[PDB]
Symmetry: D2
Subunit: 118 residues, 4 copies
């Protein structure tokens, strides 16, 4: 259920393939941020999630460099997939920019996002 | 550089190879939590960091499933490499557990960790 | 705007008073977690907000001790009030438990919540 | 135990009084950030902690407005006090700026800070 195209409320587009092994592979297109076009993403997910009614833990990273720009920054999303008619991926993310040590205290933004199929 | 074997204050072991395309690949061994032995990790880093003195942004993900057990959870570390005194990776992390919907509100732990090579 | 009774998605109840000097006071009632009935809260808000459509920064804290039980934990919410149309308060929160040193790595939960008066 | 002057690595200084009922009151002096002079802080702490060696949960807020300036932003620190020979306050913090709706995605910084009785 994770492989495919997912959207967040901010207008970004996450295209993923979930390998049989636990790999997450794909591209991210950010609607906001110092970004343009697609960026490589790589991640991991629980390929044998709980057999009750729990989501599927996952995580992925995008470093914000591609052929057109480099934002000298990296976002990790940590969350879980919840399947069904309104499948979704509920995440929290951390966006760290490379900084001088004097500015390291403000290197990291924190946010959250729910991704959907529509 | 970032390729190498790194350790945090807890004694976990992070073994990573940074590839030229921006890929991070390796294994992670947790000194605490619902884990044993090594776990696959994958992530991304800025392959062309600023020369201005800033760190190098990166992130990586561990899904806490391997051959011996499955914690149904995933941690992402978001941070920057500092090829500084000791070189170090300063991170913040998010550990998300697959939960039921009623428990999603407590799905995610947050913490921070500095890794060094000794 | 801020002064009022607010609810989050979890159905918890946030009853707050904004004093004219930047003080937030009131009670919090959690619908989930190791809590029951009302808990004291206190916090601070920007009493002279930007007047450029920006939100009103604020935060508040609940220590989860009251006459009925004590969870030995405390949550802080950090967010901004957005007035107008449908007023809401958008937050991120940090729930820290008193733990031993060895368990401090898992002492803190993070989440997010939007409060509305509906 | 918590009452007194506390220092972090950034050079900021936090003065706090822990009330018997659980209130935290005082001022925070930041040494980095869009900040000058002292700022009011208020918060709460577990005033009947575990005696088992476990830390004392607590949190506080600073709205970064005082008589000298206004950063239109607020920080909350969430953490636990650990007493002893080497007392400290182990925290994580969220600093939220007021922002337009379209900028909300980047409204909040996250960080961590250990406070000590000695600089
Ligand atoms: O601005 C940068 O440093 C690079 C672009 C970051 C875009 C962020 S990642 C979190 C949020 N969700 C998105 O889809 N875009 C932003
Ligand atoms: O869900 C679990 O218990 C497995 C998580 C593994 C341990 C966590 S990840 C963050 C922190 N750093 C470590 O080295 N271990 C813990
Ligand atoms: O369980 C505890 O340690 C004390 C109660 C904490 C409840 C949390 S605070 C964040 C979230 N929002 C709520 O309304 N309840 C939970
Ligand atoms: O810049 C602002 O928006 C107001 C001041 C922010 C200062 C931050 S709060 C977290 C960290 N700890 C400090 O002592 N200063 C910074």
């Amino acid at each position: 259920g994770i492989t495919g195209t997912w959207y967040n409320q901010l207008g970004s587009t996450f295209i993923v393939t979930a390998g049989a092994d636990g790999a997450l592979t794909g591209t991210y297109e950010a609607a906001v941020g110092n970004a343009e076009s697609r960026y490589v993403l790589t991640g991991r997910y629980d390929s044998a999630p709980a057999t009750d009614g729990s989501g599927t833990a996952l995580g992925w990273t995008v470093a914000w460099k591609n052929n057109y720009r480099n934002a000298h920054s990296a976002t990790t999303w940590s969350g879980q997939y919840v399947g069904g008619a309104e499948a979704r991926i509920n995440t929290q993310w951390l966006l760290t920019s490379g900084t001088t040590e004097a500015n390291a205290w403000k290197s990291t933004l924190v946010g959250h996002a729910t991704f959907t199929k529509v």
